[PDB]
Amino acid sequence: GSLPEARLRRVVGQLDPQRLWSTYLRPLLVVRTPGSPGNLQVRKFLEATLRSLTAGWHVELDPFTASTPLGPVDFGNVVATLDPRAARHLTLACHYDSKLFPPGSTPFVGATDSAVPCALLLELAQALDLELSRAKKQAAPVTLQLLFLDGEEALKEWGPKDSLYGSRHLAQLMESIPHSPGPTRIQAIELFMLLDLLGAPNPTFYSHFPRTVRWFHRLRSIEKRLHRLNLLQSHPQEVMYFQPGEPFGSVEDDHIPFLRRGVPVLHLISTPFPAVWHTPADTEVNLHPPTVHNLCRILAVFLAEYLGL
């Protein structure tokens, strides 16, 4: 169920690293705390970019107001579903908000956390647009969904109530909406793959959920293959990212509200975290571009194999 070497090198060749970097990543690297103008502008940028894709995605916002330590705040999740008619979908997710820090420092823009995840999803959707479009026209049975969640980060301290505002809301919302066969939109998620903390040098990923280990093994195999095919940079050893064995640690994140409702999850998060995590140095200059593009190639092959593109 793997690509022939020919399909694979063509798929990798559809990626455009400058597009990823300049068209998708750079515009996100602004302060975008919930309720801010910057957050609103990034939301509108994601929406408009997704609506421009030629495949003709269904794009909708999930807006809500919630109580926070800062008083009422308005949040909005961006939900892009390629074929709303389809029974089920692979869902790829990330958070688009940036963590609020108090005034008086260099602004926190969360390059790894999660501007790079956001940009990867946009690049994958654009690079595979012709294949995705063809699949949707063929009424392919499993479509693609991209979620850009708001309010992942705590506004003032992490706990079950000041965190995950967007994902908690969206999971409850999906539970309340009928789908066919469903019976609700929660059952339409065939797999929930959450990208977080990506773009630093030397990431390490582990399988967080035995239920989904087969897909983790697929990612590891694709890393090894692309290494052997001379398609990964600054990758001097065949397995570097996808590590076998017990996880370093689990991480509370936007998958939790879905996991608790029985959705299968793969958590694609570096553990240990980037050295710059939750400091103002989590910026563009501290990203490692070759790693970002390595991950984009791994993910593009994964996506084409998962969906038969």
Ligand SMILES: c1ccc(Cn2ccnc2)cc1
């Ligand atoms: C502790 C608690 C929660 C997290 C979740 N997280 C992920 C990205 N930024 C924050 C990480 C560590």
Ligand SMILES: [Zn+2]
């Ligand atoms: Zn964070």
